[PDB]
Amino acid sequence: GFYWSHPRKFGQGSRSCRVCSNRHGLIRKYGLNMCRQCFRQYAKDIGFIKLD
Amino acid sequence: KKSYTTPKKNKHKRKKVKLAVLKYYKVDENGKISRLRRECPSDECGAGVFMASHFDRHYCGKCCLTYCFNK
Amino acid sequence: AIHRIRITLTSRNVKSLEKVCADLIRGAKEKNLKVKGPVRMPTKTLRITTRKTPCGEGSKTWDRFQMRIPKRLIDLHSPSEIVKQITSISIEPGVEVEVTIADA
Amino acid sequence: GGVMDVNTALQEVLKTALIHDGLARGIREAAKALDKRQAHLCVQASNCDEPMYVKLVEALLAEHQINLIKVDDNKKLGEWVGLCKIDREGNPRKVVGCSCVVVKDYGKESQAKDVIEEYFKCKK
Amino acid sequence: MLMPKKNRIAIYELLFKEGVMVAKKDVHMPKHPELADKNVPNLHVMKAMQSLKSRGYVKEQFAWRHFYWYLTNEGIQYLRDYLHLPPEIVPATLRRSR
RNA sequence: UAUUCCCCAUGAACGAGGAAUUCCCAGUAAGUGCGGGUCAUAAGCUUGCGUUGAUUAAGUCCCUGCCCUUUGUACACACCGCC
RNA sequence: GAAGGGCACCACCAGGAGUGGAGCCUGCGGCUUAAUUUGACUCAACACGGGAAACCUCACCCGGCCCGGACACGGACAGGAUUGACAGAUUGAUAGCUCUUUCUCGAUUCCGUGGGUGGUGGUGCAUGGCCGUUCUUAGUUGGUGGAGCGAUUUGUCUGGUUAAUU
């Protein structure tokens, strides 16, 4: 067990979607780390309700 | 797309050599074992650890496979 | 004992927070002591604005995902009974309750 | 069940040393086990081309840290240690010759370890 | 009956010790909560357990990248016979109820 | 393969934009920063926010495109048709 | 390119603001390029895929490593299946990935066969969901009647009204 090495510490190497491990359009804010779609799926359940 | 030409040098997938390995063990008359050649400095490879002649290489194989030098 | 207790009520549901908030006033005033009624902090609006579209295309429409979080808090002075009565009763929905010891 | 038939008293100690992870299993690890207290019990092959290899065993075995047995045949000497992955239901599993292991840390205790190491140290 | 012996023999006996073994799908952990004497992340765990299911001596869920390894009644035999463990054994689901 | 920033240094076209065409009526257009989002690094990007805050329509279908009604239709892959 | 009615500043009028001109930004097109992966083609494709990318991203090219070949089914007891190898030839790499040497884990290993397992491979004219839009436009539907043998039709409308069969 050796070699699989870089900065996996910053850069999107590191961070990915908690639901589906895709690595774009990522809701970093507010300690979510969902992909932007994985919001609208896991959104009502979270608590973000569309008001206005 | 392309279809891969490959510069005609189809690289070798290689066998790690066959080798019975342990015949060369000097049993001088009664039961007693020790030959001499070159040695490695490691701990799990404790003193018995054993070396060579190649086109250069020499290696030591006894912190399981952890630790081959550079000669 | 009589110590400077703060109860910090943080929840999302305004109605299901102010049934609890009222029950702490009416729970303490039953066994009267002191209070300084419910304080009203600014409500924090957790506002996210993502594209409606998965993938690229269509005229650019986004949603406006919101979550509120109103904080009430209620000061009081009591022993380790009146705290452990008033806090454990009037729980239930999605309501978080803090209990500060005194002053800091 | 498990009351020791013929040549199956070494088999449970080898099968439990196998699975307890610690078999100094060959001329090399056997001799580096016999060189230390790493050695304990063993099963040598009667049949042996250039019997210098059985002699290196015997000579080390016969020192303090007293070992031995005998077990006839090269062609049997492994299938009561560990060496088969199940592939094929009727076990035709494997097939070359077999030779000198060094059984370390027995397995736990009992089963065949009060049979063979009370019977070997005191063959009476 | 495979791979790094020290690590994988410990993964079996972890799973026999427990009713359920959760994980994460992440090759780059060098650890896993409870056990992890050494390294043995996903890989050594997965490689073992994704063997166990396919032969049949464990059953899955997945649920937001994690692997939901639930121990099968047939596996009770496979792993205790792997681990020579006592014919009572009692894995973990002893379960005093009421 | 000026990352981003600073400090120097060089120091361009543009003196209101040819054919076209979108935006909208009140705290509206415009300017104006500022947050957020994007971020290790970082925005000329968007989405919000005030702030300064105008002119002008307040009607019509004249162009474009929409609704109903009546009607004609050899169109029903519906006129970007059929022939 | 019929007619009445009605309506929208993605229409106009009345303007301002611009926009279209310059430089610059970055969006695409093309050429060029080994590579400038790529989706997206009027409108409802063009700072849009949250698409501000050194490395990751990343798939793509010039290489080059690595195996993470589950699983079973087969093959491999030992003169140890090759688990895993500290100085140099090298190589980019202190990649035993490979050319001797060998010293350990030690029942793992390796080689077949079937079979997977993935794949930011393919196909959005094989689909789910989600989105875009025809279209914040006024529309759509049935129960009972009444009309049509019956598809169908009225109810669902001349006019006044209304942001809006309201």
Side-chain angles (χ1 to χ4, degrees):
Chain A
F2 89 161
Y3 284 12
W4 245 207
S5 328
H6 264 157
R8 205 88 34 235
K9 66 185 196 169
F10 56 64
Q12 50 263 336
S14 70
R15 83 194 71 68
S16 50
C17 186
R18 294 192 288 101
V19 210
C20 45
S21 318
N22 18 289
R23 316 181 39 253
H24 305 248
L26 230 159
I27 310 310
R28 190 81 97 78
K29 183 181 180 166
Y30 261 166
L32 271 97
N33 324 294
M34 315 283 284
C35 38
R36 72 203 185 114
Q37 284 70 345
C38 297
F39 238 153
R40 291 138 50 77
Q41 292 276 347
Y42 288 75
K44 283 292 188 69
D45 307 356
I46 280 163
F48 314 113
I49 163 160
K50 198 191 298 87
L51 301 173
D52 98 76
Chain B
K1 305 167 180 179
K2 189 141 281 182
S3 84
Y4 206 58
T5 54
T6 231
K8 61 116 73 194
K9 192 185 288 187
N10 278 358
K11 292 206 80 180
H12 290 323
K13 194 79 199 175
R14 290 286 247 35
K15 306 124 70 186
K16 324 187 305 311
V17 210
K18 298 163 186 172
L19 310 182
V21 185
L22 280 151
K23 219 50 50 217
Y24 290 74
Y25 226 151
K26 186 143 281 180
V27 189
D28 197 34
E29 194 171 75
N30 214 229
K32 61 202 82 171
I33 38 172
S34 44
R35 52 144 164 236
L36 202 54
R37 283 274 201 64
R38 300 283 280 2
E39 288 98 62
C40 146
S42 191
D43 259 9
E44 284 207 4
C45 337
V49 63
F50 228 56
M51 311 207 299
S53 52
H54 214 154
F55 271 135
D56 175 77
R57 283 294 255 350
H58 255 32
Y59 50 133
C60 133
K62 228 57 151 212
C63 324
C64 45
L65 129 75
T66 333
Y67 314 38
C68 101
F69 220 38
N70 307 99
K71 225 172 195 147
Chain C
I2 302 176
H3 63 307
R4 282 69 230 259
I5 215 84
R6 192 160 299 144
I7 304 173
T8 323
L9 291 170
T10 76
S11 191
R12 185 191 305 200
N13 285 74
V14 171
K15 204 186 172 190
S16 89
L17 188 54
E18 271 203 61
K19 78 167 181 177
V20 169
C21 190
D23 204 27
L24 313 205
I25 301 154
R26 297 195 64 82
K29 207 73 159 287
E30 266 183 284
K31 306 164 68 181
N32 53 151
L33 23 109
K34 229 137 182 290
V35 49
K36 276 73 171 289
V39 180
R40 258 141 240 154
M41 278 63 203
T43 187
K44 309 194 145 214
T45 63
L46 309 213
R47 234 167 27 70
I48 330 299
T49 33
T50 79
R51 288 287 309 245
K52 269 190 182 171
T53 311
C55 322
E57 274 213 353
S59 32
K60 293 104 184 206
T61 40
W62 317 5
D63 307 308
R64 317 228 25 236
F65 281 93
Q66 253 183 301
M67 181 209 291
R68 276 122 184 249
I69 164 44
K71 292 207 306 181
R72 349 258 85 213
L73 57 85
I74 315 177
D75 267 22
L76 277 181
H77 310 278
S78 29
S80 71
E81 178 194 58
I82 294 167
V83 173
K84 305 295 177 168
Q85 182 198 61
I86 294 170
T87 55
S88 69
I89 300 161
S90 81
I91 51 176
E92 264 83 12
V95 179
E96 222 277 22
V97 188
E98 309 246 329
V99 191
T100 318
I101 299 157
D103 288 44
Chain D
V3 298
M4 260 78 264
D5 297 38
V6 182
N7 48 21
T8 201
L10 229 163
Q11 303 194 153
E12 199 109 332
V13 179
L14 282 161
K15 290 271 183 171
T16 55
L18 168 200
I19 206 165
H20 203 87
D21 332 296
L23 226 310
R25 73 92 95 27
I27 181 53
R28 179 134 283 290
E29 267 201 288
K32 209 81 174 70
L34 269 305
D35 261 272
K36 310 199 293 180
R37 281 81 274 201
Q38 266 314 298
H40 256 203
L41 207 268
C42 165
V43 51
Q44 93 133 251
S46 66
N47 216 342
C48 180
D49 317 62
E50 55 187 74
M52 293 150 172
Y53 154 46
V54 288
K55 196 190 294 183
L56 292 184
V57 164
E58 283 145 16
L60 288 164
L61 299 189
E63 299 264 338
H64 309 40
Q65 213 294 135
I66 187 56
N67 169 269
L68 263 156
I69 207 306
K70 216 287 179 289
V71 176
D72 197 49
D73 247 359
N74 273 143
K75 212 74 89 96
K76 287 186 161 50
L77 214 158
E79 229 173 297
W80 3 282
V81 205
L83 34 96
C84 33
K85 270 251 281 169
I86 205 162
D87 358 333
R88 220 270 155 74
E89 202 205 6
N91 335 219
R93 275 268 29 71
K94 317 235 295 117
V95 191
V96 84
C98 196
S99 77
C100 314
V101 320
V102 164
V103 181
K104 327 187 282 185
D105 216 273
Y106 28 110
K108 222 156 59 183
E109 252 168 21
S110 85
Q111 299 287 316
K113 302 141 198 81
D114 259 345
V115 179
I116 67 170
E117 215 50 21
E118 190 274 305
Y119 159 166
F120 202 88
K121 195 180 170 197
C122 193
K123 282 194 286 277
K124 293 189 172 293
Chain E
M1 65 309 168
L2 237 270
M3 268 203 310
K5 221 69 43 51
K6 184 220 300 300
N7 301 312
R8 232 253 251 190
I9 197 168
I11 288 295
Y12 276 86
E13 73 104 353
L14 158 61
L15 181 71
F16 232 98
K17 189 60 161 182
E18 310 304 53
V20 73
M21 182 255 290
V22 308
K24 176 160 168 180
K25 175 164 190 169
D26 165 35
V27 158
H28 309 243
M29 282 201 302
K31 251 182 185 75
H32 161 151
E34 207 197 56
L35 202 86
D37 88 72
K38 192 69 164 169
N39 295 201
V40 73
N42 199 85
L43 100 70
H44 312 158
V45 176
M46 197 221 167
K47 286 286 146 305
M49 297 302 124
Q50 59 119 342
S51 82
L52 275 306
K53 96 175 93 72
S54 28
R55 51 163 164 269
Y57 322 99
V58 82
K59 166 80 198 176
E60 288 269 60
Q61 255 347 311
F62 200 89
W64 302 67
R65 51 110 111 256
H66 247 216
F67 294 110
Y68 262 66
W69 283 307
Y70 139 87
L71 186 49
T72 52
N73 250 25
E74 208 90 313
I76 292 304
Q77 205 163 281
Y78 190 105
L79 316 162
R80 109 229 271 208
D81 133 358
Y82 183 90
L83 294 171
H84 72 53
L85 286 160
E88 286 198 326
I89 230 305
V90 52
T93 183
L94 185 156
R95 306 294 33 187
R96 149 125 277 188
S97 171
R98 277 144 41 79

